[PDB]
């Protein structure tokens, strides 16, 4: 390939790692945000379970 293209390929991957790492931990937070409010009756329902 050409080095001015490979500079634009390699830097595009580095920006994509900065996008997917940020957007995974947005889902890692909201799945724990669902976890702190799910145990308001379900943990008591677990005693009924």
């Amino acid at each position: 390939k050409g080095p001015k293209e490979l500079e634009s390929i390699n830097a595009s991957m580095k920006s994509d790692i900065e996008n997917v790492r940020q957007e995974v931990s947005s889902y890692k937070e909201k799945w724990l945000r669902d976890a702190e409010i799910f145990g308001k009756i379900t943990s008591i329902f677990k005693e009924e379970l």
Binding site: G2, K4, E5, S8
Partner: protein, 52 residues
């Protein structure tokens, strides 16, 4: 002497345009809004132009 100076300024003219070995072009682009490329305005690198 004039019959030698006249013949060596015709092979200087016949060497700048007619046989004139040139470069083979690799196309590099950086902006994503071009989509059309005419192969007339391909210029070489800035580091190669200073050497040549």
């Amino acid at each position: 002497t004039f019959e030698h100076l006249n013949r060596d300024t015709l092979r200087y003219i016949n060497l700048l345009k007619r046989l004139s070995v040139d470069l083979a072009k690799q196309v590099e682009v950086s902006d994503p809004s071009v989509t059309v490329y005419e192969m007339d305005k391909w210029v070489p690198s800035e580091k190669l132009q200073g050497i040549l």
